[PDB]
Amino acid sequence: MRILILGMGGTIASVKGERGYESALSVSKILKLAGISSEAKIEARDLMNVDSTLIQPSDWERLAKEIEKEVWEYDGIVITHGTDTMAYSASMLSFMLRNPPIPIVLTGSMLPITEKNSDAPFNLRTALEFVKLGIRGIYIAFNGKVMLGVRASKIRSMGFDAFESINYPNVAEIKDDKLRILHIPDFYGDEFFSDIKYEPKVLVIKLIPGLSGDIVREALRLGYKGIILEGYGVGGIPYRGTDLFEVVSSISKRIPVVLTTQAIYDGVDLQRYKVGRIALEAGVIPAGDMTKEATITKLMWILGHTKNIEEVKQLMGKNITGELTRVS
Amino acid sequence: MRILILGMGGTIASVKGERGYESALSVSKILKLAGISSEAKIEARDLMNVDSTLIQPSDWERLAKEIEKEVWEYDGIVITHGTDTMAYSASMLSFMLRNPPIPIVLTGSMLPITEKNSDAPFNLRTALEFVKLGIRGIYIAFNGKVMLGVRASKIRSMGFDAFESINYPNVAEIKDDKLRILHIPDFYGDEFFSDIKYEPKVLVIKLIPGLSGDIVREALRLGYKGIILEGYGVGGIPYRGTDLFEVVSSISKRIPVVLTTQAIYDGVDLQRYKVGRIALEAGVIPAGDMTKEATITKLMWILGHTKNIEEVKQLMGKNITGELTRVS
Numbered sequence: 001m002r003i004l005i006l007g008m009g010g011t012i013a014s015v016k017g018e019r020g021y022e023s024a025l026s027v028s029k030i031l032k033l034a035g036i037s038s039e040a041k042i043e044a045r046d047l048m049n050v051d052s053t054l055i056q057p058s059d060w061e062r063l064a065k066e067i068e069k070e071v072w073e074y075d076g077i078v079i080t081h082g083t084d085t086m087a088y089s090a091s092m093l094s095f096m097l098r099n100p101p102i103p104i105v106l107t108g109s110m111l112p113i114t115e116k117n118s119d120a121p122f123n124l125r126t127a128l129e130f131v132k133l134g135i136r137g138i139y140i141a142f143n144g145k146v147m148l149g150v151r152a153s154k155i156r157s158m159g160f161d162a163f164e165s166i167n168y169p170n171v172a173e174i175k176d177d178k179l180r181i182l183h184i185p186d187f188y189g190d191e192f193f194s195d196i197k198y199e200p201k202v203l204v205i206k207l208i209p210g211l212s213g214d215i216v217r218e219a220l221r222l223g224y225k226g227i228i229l230e231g232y233g234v235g236g237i238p239y240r241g242t243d244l245f246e247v248v249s250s251i252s253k254r255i256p257v258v259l260t261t262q263a264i265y266d267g268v269d270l271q272r273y274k275v276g277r278i279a280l281e282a283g284v285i286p287a288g289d290m291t292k293e294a295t296i297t298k299l300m301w302i303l304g305h306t307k308n309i310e311e312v313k314q315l316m317g318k319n320i321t322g323e324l325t326r327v328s
Numbered sequence: 329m330r331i332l333i334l335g336m337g338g339t340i341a342s343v344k345g346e347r348g349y350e351s352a353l354s355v356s357k358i359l360k361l362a363g364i365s366s367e368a369k370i371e372a373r374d375l376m377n378v379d380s381t382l383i384q385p386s387d388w389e390r391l392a393k394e395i396e397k398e399v400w401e402y403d404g405i406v407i408t409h410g411t412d413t414m415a416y417s418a419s420m421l422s423f424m425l426r427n428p429p430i431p432i433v434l435t436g437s438m439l440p441i442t443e444k445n446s447d448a449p450f451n452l453r454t455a456l457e458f459v460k461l462g463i464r465g466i467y468i469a470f471n472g473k474v475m476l477g478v479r480a481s482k483i484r485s486m487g488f489d490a491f492e493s494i495n496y497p498n499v500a501e502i503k504d505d506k507l508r509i510l511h512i513p514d515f516y517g518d519e520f521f522s523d524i525k526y527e528p529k530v531l532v533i534k535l536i537p538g539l540s541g542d543i544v545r546e547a548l549r550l551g552y553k554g555i556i557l558e559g560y561g562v563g564g565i566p567y568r569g570t571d572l573f574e575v576v577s578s579i580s581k582r583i584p585v586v587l588t589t590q591a592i593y594d595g596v597d598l599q600r601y602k603v604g605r606i607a608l609e610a611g612v613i614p615a616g617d618m619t620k621e622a623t624i625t626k627l628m629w630i631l632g633h634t635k636n637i638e639e640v641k642q643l644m645g646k647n648i649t650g651e652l653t654r655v656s
Contacts, residue, residue, distance in 0.1 A: 021600065
C-alpha cells in the first residue's frame with residue numbers, strides 16, 4: 001500500500017504566532033503528530049505551505065502536474081490543504097484529471113494538529129483509511145465523511161462539521177466506528193488523462209435588490225472572460241426598476257454569463273419561473289445543481305480552451321465528472 | 329383580534345401557466361383558495377403583486393409607510409411575499425421600524441396554491457396562529473417555524489424547508505399540531521422608531537482564487553457607496569499574487585468595505601488568522617455572525633444616514649435590532 005501525501009499548508013499546519021494562526025509546519029511533522037504508526041507505505045512531500053485563502057489558480061496547475069506524474073507511482077494520494085479554498089482545489093482537480101486510476105483525497109482540519117480537541121488526526125486517519133478501499137476519484141474527507149470532490153461545499157466557518165455533500169450523497173461515512181462505503185461514484189472511464197488548462201479571470205457577483213447592470217458592463221471592459229451571477233433561488237434576473245436584465249441580454253452574447261443560486265441546496269431551474277424563462281431566452285447559462293465552487297472552476301476550466309458562448313453553454317450543462325445531476 | 333394582510337406578490341400569489349409561474353392572484357383570492365377560516369377580523373389588502381425576484385428597494389419604502397400607518401389600528405400584520413427576497417424585506421423593515429408594537433410576519437410558499445401538495449395554506453395558517461400570540465417584532469413564518477426576520481436566510485431554492493434561522497434559535501415551532509413559543513426576543517425598547525431612509529447602491533462580490541481589485545476600483549468609480557466581499561471562512565483578504573488587498577486598503581478609506589463569509593453558519597472572526605488581522609488593519613469592517621441579508625440591508629440603511637467610515641463601522645458593530653451577537 002503505497003501512499004503519497006502532499007502538503008499545501010493550511011490551518012492544519014499552523015500555529016498561533018503573533019497575529020493569529022499562520023501556516024508553518026511540514027507534512028512529516030503533521031504526519032507524526034497523528035497515528036502515523038498505522039504503518040502502510042507512506043511518504044510526505046511539501047508542494048507549498050500557504051494559508052489556504054492565498055491559494056491561486058496557478059497552484060492548482062502546479063498541484064495537478066505533480067499528481068499526474070505520480071498516479072502510477074502510488075496506490076492513493078492524500079493532500080493536506082487549507083479548508084477555505086479546499087472545495088475549489090478539489091473541484092478544479094476533478095476537471096483537470098479525468099479518469100484518475102487511484103483515490104485522491106484532500107483533507108485538513110479546523111484546528112492546528114498542534115492543539116488538543118484537534119480534528120486533524122481523525123481527519124487524516126479517515127483519509128488514509130479511505131484510500132485502502134481502492135475507490136478511485138477525487139474526494140474530500142472531513143469530520144467522518146468522505147464526499148465526492150465536486151459536490152462538497154464549505155458551509156460552516158468554525159465547526160468541525162464544516163463540509164457537506166451538496167445535492168448528492170456522501171460516498172463514505174463512519175458507521176459503528178469504521179468507514180463504510182455508501183456508494184461508488186461510477187462516472188470514471190478507463191483511460192486516464194489530464195486536461196490541465198484554464199482561464200482564471202471570471203467575476204462572481206451576488207444579485208441583490210436594485211443591483212444595476214453597470215458592474216456587468218464594466219467587467220467586460222476590464223477584461224473579465226466570464227461572469228457568474230449568484231441569484232436568489234430557482235432563477236431569474238431582475239428587469240424591474242433596473243437595467244440589469246437589459247445589460248445582461250447583450251453582455252451574454254459577448255462572454256458567458258452564468259446564473260447559479262445563493263441558496264445552498266437544490267440548484268437552479270430556469271423553467272420554473274416565467275422570469276427564469278425570460279433569462280434563459282436572453283442568453284443566460286444555468287448552472288443546474290452544481291456547487292458554487294464547481295461552477296466557478298468548471299467555467300474557468302472551459303474558458304481554458306474556448307470563448308464560444310454556445311460551446312461554453314453545452315459544456316457547462318454536460319456532466320463531466322459527477323458535478324451535475326441529469327436535468328429533465 | 330384585528331389582523332391586516334398585505335400582499336406584495338411572490339410564488340404564493342402566482343399560478344403555474346404556459347410560461348412557468350407568474351403573478352396572478354390578489355390577497356383575497358389567496359385566502360379564499362387557501363380555505364382560510366374567514367375575513368371578519370381579517371382585512372386583506374394588495375399593495376402590489378410583483379413576480380418572484382423582482383422586488384426593488386423602493387418597494388420597501390412603500391411597505392414600511394403602510395405598516396407604520398397601521399401598527400396602532402391592528403393587533404397583527406401578515407405580509408404575503410416572494411421567497412427569493414423575503415429575508416431582505418424582513419431585514420430592511422426591521423431597521424426601518426424599530427420596536428414595533430405588534431407582531432409583523434412575512435410568509436409565502438415554494439409552490440403556488442393551485443399546485444398539488446402546496447405549502448401555501450399551511451404557511452398562511454402558521455403566520456395567523458403566530459400573530460394571535462401577541463409577541464411583537466418582525467418575523468418570517470415558514471414550514472411550521474417562526475424565525476426573527478433579521479436572522480432568517482433562504483437556504484433551499486426548492487425544498488419546503490426553505491428558510492433557516494442562522495446562528496440564533498427559532499422563536500416558535502409547531503408541536504402537536506400547535507404553535508409553541510420557544511423564546512421571546514427581548515431587545516425591543518419602548519419607542520416605536522420610524523427611520524425609512526437608506527442608500528441602495530452597494531455591491532456584493534464573492535472572493536475567489538485569483539480575484540483582482542480592479543473590479544473593486546471600478547465599483548467606486550461607478551458610484552457604489554459601499555462594498556461587501558463575501559470571504560472564504562472566518563475571514564480574510566487574499567494579498568498573494570493579486571492586487572486585491574492593495575486596492576481594498578485605499579478603497580476602504582473612501583467607502584465602507586465589509587467582509588462577510590461564503591459559509592452560511594458561524595460567521596466572521598477577523599482576529600483568528602493572520603490574514604484576518606491584516607484585513608482589519610486595512611480598514612475592513614467585520615459582519616460578525618449576521619445573515620448575508622441582514623448585512624446587506626443594514627449597510628444600505630446605515631449609508632442612508634452617514635457616509636463617515638468609523639461611524640459606519642460603529643453602527644455595523646452595534647446590535648441594532650437583534651441581528652447580531654455580542655463581543656463584536
